[PDB]
UniProtKB/Swiss-Prot annotation, chain A:
Keywords: Antibiotic resistance, Repressor, Ribonucleoprotein, Ribosomal protein, Ribosome biogenesis, RNA-binding, rRNA-binding, Transcription, Transcription antitermination, Transcription regulation, Transcription termination, Translation regulation. The gene is rpsD. It comes from Escherichia coli (strain K12). HAMAP family: Ribosomal_uS4_B (MF_01306_B). Residues 95-155 form the S4 RNA-binding domain. Disulfide bonds: none annotated. It holds the Pfam family S4. One of its GO terms (molecular function) is structural constituent of ribosome. The keyword Transmembrane does not apply. GO terms for cellular component: cytoplasm; cytosol; cytosolic small ribosomal subunit; small ribosomal subunit. NCBIfam families: PRK05327.1 (NF003717), rpsD_bact (TIGR01017). This is Small ribosomal subunit protein uS4.
UniProtKB/Swiss-Prot annotation, chain B:
The chain holds residues 64 to 124 of 124 of the full protein. The modification 3-methylthioaspartic acid is found at residue 26. Changing residue 25 to Q: Confers low-level resistance to streptomycin and a 15% decrease in the translational elongation rate. It comes from the Bacteria. The gene is rpsL. It comes from Escherichia coli (strain K12). Part of the 30S ribosomal subunit. Contacts proteins S8 and S17. Interacts with ArfA. May interact with IF1 in the 30S initiation complex. At least 19 substitutions or deletions in 11 codons can promote streptomycin resistance, dependence or pseudodependence; all but one of the streptomycin resistant mutations (K42R) are associated with hyperaccurate translation and thus reduced translational efficiency. This is Small ribosomal subunit protein uS12. Belongs to the universal ribosomal protein uS12 family. The modification N6-acetyllysine is found at residue 45. With S4 and S5 plays an important role in translational accuracy.
From Swiss-Prot, chain C:
GO terms for cellular component: cytoplasm; cytosolic small ribosomal subunit; small ribosomal subunit. GO terms for molecular function: DNA endonuclease activity; four-way junction DNA binding; structural constituent of ribosome. It comes from Escherichia coli (strain K12). Part of the 30S ribosomal subunit. Induction: Part of the rpsP-rimM-trmD-rplS operon. This is Small ribosomal subunit protein bS16. Keywords: Endonuclease, Hydrolase, Nuclease, Ribonucleoprotein, Ribosomal protein. PROSITE patterns: RIBOSOMAL_S16. InterPro entries: Ribosomal_bS16 (IPR000307), Ribosomal_bS16_CS (IPR020592), Ribosomal_bS16_dom_sf (IPR023803). Belongs to the bacterial ribosomal protein bS16 family. GO terms for biological process: cytoplasmic translation; ribosomal small subunit assembly. The lineage of its organism: Bacteria, Pseudomonadati, Pseudomonadota, Gammaproteobacteria, Enterobacterales. In addition to being a ribosomal protein, S16 also has a cation-dependent endonuclease activity.
From Swiss-Prot, chain D:
This is Small ribosomal subunit protein uS17. One of its GO terms (cellular component) is cytoplasm. One of the primary rRNA binding proteins, it binds specifically to the 5'-end of 16S ribosomal RNA. Also plays a role in translational accuracy; neamine-resistant ribosomes show reduced neamine-induced misreading in vitro. Belongs to the universal ribosomal protein uS17 family. Gene3D superfamilies: Nucleic acid-binding proteins. One of its GO terms (biological process) is cytoplasmic translation. GO terms for molecular function: rRNA binding; small ribosomal subunit rRNA binding; structural constituent of ribosome; zinc ion binding. It comes from Escherichia coli (strain K12). InterPro entries: NA-bd_OB-fold, Ribosomal_uS17, Ribosomal_uS17_bact/chlr, Ribosomal_uS17_CS. Part of the 30S ribosomal subunit. The keyword GTP-binding does not apply. The gene is rpsQ. PROSITE patterns: RIBOSOMAL_S17.
Length: 205, 61, 82, 83, 71, 86
RNA sequence: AAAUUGAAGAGUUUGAUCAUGGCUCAGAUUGAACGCUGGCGGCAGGCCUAACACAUGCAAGUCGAACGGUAACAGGAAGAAGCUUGCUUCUUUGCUGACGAGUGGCGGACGGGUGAGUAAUGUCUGGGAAACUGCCUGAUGGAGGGGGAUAACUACUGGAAACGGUAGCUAAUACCGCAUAACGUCGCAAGACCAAAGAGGGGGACCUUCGGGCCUCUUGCCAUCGGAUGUGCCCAGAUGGGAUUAGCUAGUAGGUGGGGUAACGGCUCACCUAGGCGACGAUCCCUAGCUGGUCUGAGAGGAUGACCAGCCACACUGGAACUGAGACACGGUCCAGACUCCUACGGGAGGCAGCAGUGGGGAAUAUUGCACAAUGGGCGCAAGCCUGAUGCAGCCAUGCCGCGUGUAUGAAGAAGGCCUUCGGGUUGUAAAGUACUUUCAGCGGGGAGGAAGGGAGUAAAGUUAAUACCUUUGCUCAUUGACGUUACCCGCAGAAGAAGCACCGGCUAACUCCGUGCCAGCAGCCGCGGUAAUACGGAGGGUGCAAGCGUUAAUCGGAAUUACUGGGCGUAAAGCGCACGCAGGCGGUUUGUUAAGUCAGAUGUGAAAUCCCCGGGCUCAACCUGGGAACUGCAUCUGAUACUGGCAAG
């Protein structure tokens, strides 16, 4: 599906930050970002230990926005593959092209990215790609459809990407609309406030 | 012996229902329920959030 | 008695053919005696759409086997005697 | 030698001639529990001559069916129950 | 009249109450379709951008009642 | 609903049965003559019967009416028996 | 080069506790059904119940390059007629393409479906010798010459029919005799013994009624003998449940000799003779296709056995055999049986546990589809025909997965909704406005792969009776799509064409107002409801998951609660009332030895794919696929002799 309706709201349940709605004035300003949502958001949480875990598997599910049936599969992969599960899972999740074009800064929120991959404005290795989740292999060309080097969603996100982004494990070029995806994560290459060991704990029984 | 969930009366003094396993333990003998939205014995009249069990079609618009 | 004939495998209009020494009087992906090659009629933007074992074929023919109308045409396709 | 069916066995009956009854004690470990335990496989062997008696140890070998169940023939008597 | 997607499984023409074979039905013919079990009298069956309902609907109501029970 | 095209196979096999059965009998009366010739006890008349059998069986063998190793078994068993009743 | 960290717990007994112990819960799985809802594509699956009857059509033919032949159709064609002026039309001609039927040849015993029977008289694993086997292939050897019959046809003659019948004639590569007759066949050997067919394409010379002998190649056919592949058989070991099933068995157990199968065998039989099987569970009865494998699970284990694939049993129900290389026959026969159909009223027909579909069953499961094109089966010298196998498409959110349902901006925090200590929060940047963009869908254009092949042609390797025919390497030219207007690609509109379902007392993430007052009503468990209900009914708010969601059914786990890995027995369930002792379980201590277990090694085996692993391709993934490795086992040989068992002496 594509999980929509009230977007910073979902994040306010998650109850810290999140990398959403990042064009303009949102980050405590015209949105309340702390408290908690709804009519019983003013008082403090009941919580539950099952809660803290499930809510952090949700967090990370929401910062990348995938569904459980995909995430169940990324857990399968981290187990299935020979490397440490919680770290490897972040890696396995990250290698998705739709976050990569976002990591390129060709959008400045993922949904911007996800739309232009899907609505077929991205090309990987010079080959037409719209599979959003796609495995970008370590050391691949990222390129954007000629026609798309001009959308207000493109230009604005390029300046948003400007002096914002350029990570360890991809390298990027703005005039040429190009990026070199260097590799997948080991431990070091990705995070935020996220829990990885709590989810493997959760998915394992 | 089947229990019959929901309000809006039983129906069918002498006709056909589909039944399903399941206890409600405070009665004697109940092992079964009738599916009110299936075959006859009409889906339970009114209601607005508890609809799937004891069928209520999407309440119109 | 047997044949060297193609067996079909894979999926809806991307079949893979897998090449087989098999009993004459059984399904074309029934039972079989030795598996002797691979054939892909989908060669599209890829190599290795034909791989086959000459030594086995020769074994089978000197004992007594018919190679099929398409399998004789895989010979035509392997082109290592021209 | 090199692949033939030749076995050793205990003789547990002689009572009609030309039949002879040879019981084989085999070990196997019981397939779930361990414990190497016995089952005794009991076989028809062609006698020809009353060379065998009871409590004896014999050698028997495959020789293709001669009568129902009865396909083994007697080779040699190791030990004769010293009667 | 329902607004539903149909197939005419095969069509047969009636001679006596025995079944004569044709393989299609054109304008101005009467016939039967074989199976096609849902429809009720006064339904209209039309082309893919259908005349939706034709006028027809009208027939009489039941004068006298009895109660039935099986044996 | 009808029989596919089995008919012509269907009829032939009865003609063939009768044909076999005749030569099968032809030999049979002879096989019986051989043992009754063993009982008559004579080497000479009974080997004369065997000598009559040796042409009779072999064409049954060749033409597929007893075939296989079937001929051979009949040929041999009886042939020796004549010698055990010299 | 792949084994490799899948070995959670929670609530419930009491005033309260530790224990003991049953129940319930969160996980994964499905050939699923149902309710509520529902966009696309891909892929995969779709009667588990009645193996219950089946309407209708279709699921097995083919050779005229076997043969007699010549209804059909078609063409060429002799002669006429009409005359058109040499064309239309007739007759007759197998002349030729061509072939209905028939004789005859090979394939209907393969493919497909079904799981009733059956506890393996088939199966799984290895090991066996007594065996058969059409094509196919390897080798030798042969194919000489003749006789009669009979279909059809044709006459006759019965039958409202189905299907005949009475009579005469004609062939073969059908039949039959004859020749010859092994490296064969039977057998001491002597000796006996049986075989076949031509036909076609062509002919470069000859014979000649160029009919046809013949010349030349292809090909067919026959004897032996191996091959290969299949099939018959055997032995041991593994395989569901009951002993509130304990004695079963004389063709049974064995032999002797005759008999018989393609072959050893009471397989069968007459003589014999007295066994065989059984608590290491015979027998009896219940249930049950098997297996690879699937599911589940750490593993061990448990569950499970049309999803695919090997195997096996079955064919309206029951018996028996035929024919054949192959069967006791899935669309054959024969008989009996139950049930159904024609009608002629005398007598005859038929089998959807093939494909589609009907009715009946049931919670529940499809299209009376497209096509021989690809693949493969069949017959064919090949063209060709034949293919409800087989490809697809059809129909079901039935599963699995991909992908969409605009995206960003955007209040000073708008109506409406809801609570409100009436302060104000919330619903919510949600909404409106803004800018950008259009997967899919819808709509216009372009369009990969599946196509390999065969036909006919020159030449030529080459038989080369020269340059024929054949034959093949290539070469020669025209030329192969069921799906299908398919993917795929380009273009054109627009924020548009499109999101549900369940849950919120604890277990279990999430929460309040108001409607009812033991009710109405919820319950997987604990329980709640008897005036302010976090359960009940709805509103707001909230959480979870999504083209689904929930729920009841089903397997395993959680469960160490049937425990080998891994439990217990004073009192919680739990030691026989006590003892002797048979079978079985178990064996102090030594030397030697043997070599069964034992362990190491080697070699054969464990089908395919599946599982697992490393690649690869379809825009990824689902999927599909190359090789690796597993393939927890058996086999036989060699070896190691401590341990144990055997065995001899302490």
């Amino acid at each position: 599906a594509r999980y929509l309706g009230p977007k910073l709201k979902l994040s306010r349940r998650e109850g810290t930050d999140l990398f959403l709605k990042s064009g303009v004035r949102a980050i405590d300003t015209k949105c309340k970002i702390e408290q908690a949502p709804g009519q019983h958001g003013a008082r403090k949480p009941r919580l539950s230990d099952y809660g803290v875990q499930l809510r952090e598997k949700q967090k990370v599910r929401r910062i990348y926005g995938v569904l459980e049936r995909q995430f169940r599969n990324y857990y399968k992969e981290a187990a299935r593959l020979k490397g440490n599960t919680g770290e490897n899972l972040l890696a396995l999740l990250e290698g998705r092209l739709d976050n990569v074009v976002y990591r390129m800064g060709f959008g400045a929120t993922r949904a911007e990215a996800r739309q232009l991959v899907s609505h077929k404005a991205i090309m990987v290795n010079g080959r037409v790609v719209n599979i959003a989740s796609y495995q970008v292999s370590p050391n691949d060309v990222v390129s954007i459809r000629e026609k798309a080097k001009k959308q207000s969603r493109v230009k604005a996100a390029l300046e948003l990407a400007e002096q914002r982004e350029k990570p360890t494990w991809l390298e990027v070029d703005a005039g040429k609309m190009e990026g070199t995806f260097k590799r997948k994560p080991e431990r070091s290459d990705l995070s935020a406030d996220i829990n990885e060991h709590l989810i493997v704990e959760l998915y394992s029984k | 012996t089947s229990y019959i969930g929901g309000e809006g009366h039983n129906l069918q003094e002498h006709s056909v229902i589909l039944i399903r396993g399941g206890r409600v333990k405070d009665l004697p003998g109940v092992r079964y329920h009738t599916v009110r939205g299936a075959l006859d014995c009409s889906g339970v009249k009114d209601r607005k959030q508890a609809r799937s069990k004891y069928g209520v079609k999407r309440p119109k618009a | 008695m047997v044949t060297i004939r193609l067996a079909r495998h894979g999926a809806k209009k991307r079949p893979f053919y897998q090449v087989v020494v098999a009993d004459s009087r059984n399904a074309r992906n029934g039972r079989f005696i030795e598996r002797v090659g691979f054939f892909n009629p989908i060669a599209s933007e890829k190599e290795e759409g034909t791989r086959l074992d000459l030594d086995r074929i020769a074994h089978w023919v000197g004992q007594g086997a018919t190679i099929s109308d398409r399998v004789a045409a895989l010979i035509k396709e392997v082109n290592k005697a021209a | 030698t090199d692949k033939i069916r030749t076995l050793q066995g205990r003789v547990v009956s002689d009572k009609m001639e030309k039949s002879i009854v040879v019981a084989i004690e085999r070990f196997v470990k019981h397939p779930i529990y361990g414990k190497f335990i016995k089952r005794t496989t009991k076989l028809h062997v062609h006698d020809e001559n009353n060379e065998c008696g009871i409590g004896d140890v014999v050698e028997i070998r495959e020789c293709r069916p001669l009568s129902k169940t009865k396909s083994w023939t007697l080779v040699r008597v190791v030990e004769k129950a010293v009667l | 009249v329902k607004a539903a997607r149909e197939r005419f499984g095969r069509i047969v023409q009636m001679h006596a109450n025995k079944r004569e074979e044709i393989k299609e039905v054109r304008a101005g013919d009467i016939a039967a379709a074989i199976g096609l079990k849902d429809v009720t009298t006064g339904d209209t069956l039309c082309d893919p951008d259908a005349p939706i309902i034709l006028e027809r609907m009208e027939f009489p109501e039941p004068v006298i009642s009895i109660a039935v029970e099986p044996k | 609903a009808n029989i596919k095209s089995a008919k012509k196979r269907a009829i032939q096999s009865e003609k063939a049965r009768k044909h076999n059965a005749s030569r099968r009998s032809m030999m049979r009366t002879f096989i019986k003559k051989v043992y009754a010739a063993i009982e008559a006890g004579d080497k000479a008349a009974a080997q004369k019967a065997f000598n009559e059998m040796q042409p009779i069986v072999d064409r049954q063998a060749a033409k597929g009416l007893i075939h296989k190793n079937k001929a051979a078994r009949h040929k041999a068993n009886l042939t020796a028996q004549i010698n055990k009743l010299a």
